[PDB]
Structures are given as C-alpha cells and as structure tokens.
C-alpha cells in the first residue's frame, strides 16, 4: 500500500497545469484594464481634497 506516495508525488504538475488557464486570464485582464485603473489612480492622487475638518467650522 505504500506505493500511493508516488501517486501523490505525481499529483503536482497536474493542477500546476490546470491553474495556468486562470493565471493567463489574470494576465489578460490586467493588460486590458490596467490603463484605466492607472488613469483613475492618477486622477485620484493628484485630485486635491482641500477642505477643513467638519468640526473646525
């Protein structure tokens, strides 16, 4: 019965291949929407919220 250790040793490199589909999808989504995300990030960073505290009157 000890032979199943090799069987589990082979389980890696199988799901490591199945997950590459989702990894590629992540990369594609990044390449698509990264420009927009960066645009909003920049406009938020340089946009000033120059207002005093509410309680400062």
């Amino acid at each position: 019965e000890q032979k199943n250790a090799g069987g589990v040793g082979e389980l890696e490199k199988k799901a490591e291949a199945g997950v590459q589909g989702e990894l590629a999808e992540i990369k594609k989504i990044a390449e698509k929407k990264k420009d927009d995300v960066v645009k909003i990030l920049i406009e938020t960073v340089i946009k000033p919220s120059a207002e005093v505290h509410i309680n400062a009157l």
């Binding site: 505290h53 509410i54 309680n55 400062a56």
Partner: protein, 587 residues
Amino acid sequence: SEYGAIYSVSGPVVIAENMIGCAMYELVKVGHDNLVGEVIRIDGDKATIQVYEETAGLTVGDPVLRTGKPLSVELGPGLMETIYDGIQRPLKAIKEESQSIYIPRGIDTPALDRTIKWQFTPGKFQVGDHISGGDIYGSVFENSLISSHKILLPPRSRGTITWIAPAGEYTLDEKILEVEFDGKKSDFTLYHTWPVRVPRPVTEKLSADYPLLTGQRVLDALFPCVQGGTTCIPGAFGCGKTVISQSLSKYSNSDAIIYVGCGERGNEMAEVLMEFPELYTEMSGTKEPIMKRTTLVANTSNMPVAAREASIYTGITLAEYFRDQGKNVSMIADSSSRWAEALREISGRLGEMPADQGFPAYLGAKLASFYERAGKAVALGSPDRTGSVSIVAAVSPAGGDFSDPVTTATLGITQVFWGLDKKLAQRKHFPSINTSVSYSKYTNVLNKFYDSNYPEFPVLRDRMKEILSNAEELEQVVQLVGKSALSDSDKITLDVATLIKEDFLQQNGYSTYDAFCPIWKTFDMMRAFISYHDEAQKAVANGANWSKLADSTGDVKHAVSSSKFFEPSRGEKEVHGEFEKLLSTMQ
C-alpha cells in the same frame, strides 16, 4: 446657540461643552448622526450625556443639539402587537425603512404608525364640557382583543372642550380635540407623549387584593402574587427566570403585557415575536393572539448599555399608561440586574464614588423608584376606572449569589421572592423554585380572596409548606444515616414530600397538560396530596407498616401522581371528577 460641542467621549458617556442652559434628563442629539442621548449631570457649561447608541466614531468638537424635551414615550393606538428598541422607536418599521438587518445609528422613526386609520368614536364629553387629565374622551378599535383603546387626555392637560371630533377613521396626526384653558386653545390627537422618567399620576393608590394567577402550581399556591404587586425572580444562568417570565406573559390574568428584555438575548425576543402570535387568550371571550395584548421593549446585550435604562422606564410607563385605561397590566422586566450594571457602567465612566461592588450609591433609590410605580390605583379623570401594574423583575445575581447588591436591594423592595435553585434546574425540576428561601408577603391579603373562593387554600398551603420543610430537614439525615433508620412517620413525610416535589411542584411548562394550571386544578391537586399524606399518617398512627402499605396503596399513589396529567381543556367540573375518582377511589 443650541449647539454644544463634544469635549470627552468614553464608552457610552459623552461630556459636552458649551452646554450652559441645559436641563437635567433633557434629550440631546450627539454628533452628526444625531445619536439620541440624555443629559445625566450638569456642571457649569459642561453637560454629561449618556448616549443611547454606539459612540464609536464620535469626535471631539462634534455638535450636540438640545431638544428641549425629556426621554418621552408616545402613548396611543398602535402600541400593542409591536416591538420597540429600548427607546420608543419601532423595530419592524426600522427594518422596513433601512431595508437591512441592522439598526442604523441615529435612525428616526415615529414610534406609533402614523398612516393607520383608527376608528375613533367619541365618549361622553361634549362641547363646553370641562376636561382634565385622564378623562376618556373617546375610544378606538385597536384589535379584536383590545376592542376599545381608551383615548385619555394627557395627565397634565385641562380646559373646556371647544371642539370634539365626530366618530370616524382618523390617523394619529389628525386633530381629535380642541380644549381652551385661560383663553389658550390646545389641540389633542389620538396619541400623546409622556416623560418615561416621571411616574403617571393616579387619583389614589389602592391596596392590591386580587391574585395574579399565573399558570404555575408552585407560584400560585405557595408564593402567590397579586395584581399590582412587585415580585423578583433571582437565579443563576439556567434556572428558568426567562421561561417563568414568558409563561406568565402567556397565561397571566393581566389584560395587557409589557415584556421588557433589558440586556437579554435577541433570540428570546425573537421567540416571543414568534410564539405569542401563535398563542391565543380567551380572556376576551374568543381566542385572540396573546401578542394582540402583549407589546415588547427588545433591548438585547449587544445593544447600547445606556438604553438598558431607557428600556425599563419605557416598559413601566407603558404599563402605567394602560393602567390609566382601567387595565390590569403586568410588566415583566427580564433582567433588572442588567439595568443596574448599565448604571454601574455609566457611574464608573462618570467619576463618582463606587459602592460595595462598583454600583453607585443611588442604585437602591433607583430600584425603589422603579418598583414604587407598580400597584393598584384609581385612574385620574372620568369615567371612574381602576387599574393595576404588576412588576415581575428577574434579577441575575453574579454567580448565583443572592448576597449581591442588586439582589439585596430588590429583596428589600419587592414583596414576592421567587428564588430559583440551580441544582433543581439541572435535574430539569421546573419551575426550579427554592421553597426554602422563597417568600410571599401577599398571603395575608389574599386571605379574603381565598375566603371567597377556596377557604381551605391557605390551610392547605401552610400544611404543604410544613411538609416540605420537614422533608428538607429530614432528607439531609437520610443522606448520611439511611432511610431505614427513620420512623415510619418520618418515612411517610419523606415519601409525601418527594411525591409533592415530583408531581405538584414540578410542572413541565412546555407541554399541553402543564403549560398552564388553573387555580381550581391547583387547589384540587393540593387537596389530593394533603389528603394522601393524612391518610398515610393515620394508617401508621393507628398501627400499620408503611413499608408494606406503600406497596398496598401503590395505585392510589399512582393516581395522585397522575392527577398532574389531566388536560385543563376539559375545564372545571370535568377535571373536578378527581373529587370522587381520586378522593373517593381511595382515602
């Protein structure tokens, strides 16, 4: 201006500055969310506020708006069959408005539904008549159980009815009465607000003389309460203080129930909202949901500690309002020790000197003032009506110790003490009432009632108390020296007391035959048990062997024990067959 500023925040206590010209116990809106709080102390321009919401996020400098009014409760139609948030705002409407499973901070919702049209019908007063506070100037049909909700003038209002509305359907905001006093005209709708911290006036305080017939044999027979009395139920954390409270709310004589959950589970206020509609009362002549006459004041433990105090005021004020309509209300306050902990938590964060166990020195005064609101009274104004407010306060002693400050104070104040025993609750002996220490000071007055309905009741009660005390003292001996070293009389006493405990005092509150036990059934069972004891004592007194007689009369004992199982449904004189099928089948 009306705007002070938050100076300090610590737990539920907010100290605000620029609060000069602020009155004690005045409501205030704290912060930008407009959290409701009450000015508890004034020191110069600094006002200390107990916030009734979560203070997380409150900033120093946040506005504090005076409202000019005390913590008030709205009183009028639409009050039964409803559950409220410690303060007087409604939880169902809150859920419907916020469309969420939480209670938003600072949400404002009118306490009474202002869109329901109520069928007002004017009373006996006409234009030009003089009206004063408490005068029933009309009635509305609220529900099939509360078929005539009296419309009373506010207690502190007066004048000559300049105008009275005709019979018809009016919302709560529609004007119903105009009354001129000193040339000034005042307008009265179907509801009015009353300060929850001021007791509602009465013409005179009567003497409570009618029993508060719960469904429990031990509480009805051994330690009775009256309508208008004060009782406390100290106990540990699983001995049934909340099951007793709910059974009383279900089967008590009270025309209305104010169930206050001051710092309790939110699944125990949910079960009341689930079972009371499914439970019905034929006190109106037809089965009407007990919920139709039972309102709720849900303020769980996860909910602000400072609203555990506004939960107890709201409940007693509602009971006083309904007593002012001629009703015999029962306020069930589960728990009074959570309101005392809230005052211990406010006092500790407030700086003044703590007492014996951190409680304020004025805890006893607060409890006394709360319990002094209960009683039988003639209601202010005409028609002449009489009402009563009973208070059933569950105390939760820290560790089950009855020497606690809250428990000692309540025992000093209350007239009935239904002390619960944890050991009995573990055996599932329910109700787990400690007969050794529990007392009822209303047994003397109830004499009259018994002399009018059950003359043997006081004597039988005293006999059963004596038997139980003897058996308590004797079981201790038997636990060490054995039962065979006792006299036959002592063994009879032990057997009788065991039978009483396991069949008379023990009452399954979640069954059909023992969910409720009417007083006639209690009296019949008491007579049966005492007669069995007398028969055994006589049989052994004139010469007999109790050891064999127990086997000989085993079936008579079985019948006495099974008297418990009679269904009360076959009311009165069908169960009363036990008068012969039990007291003549033997004895």
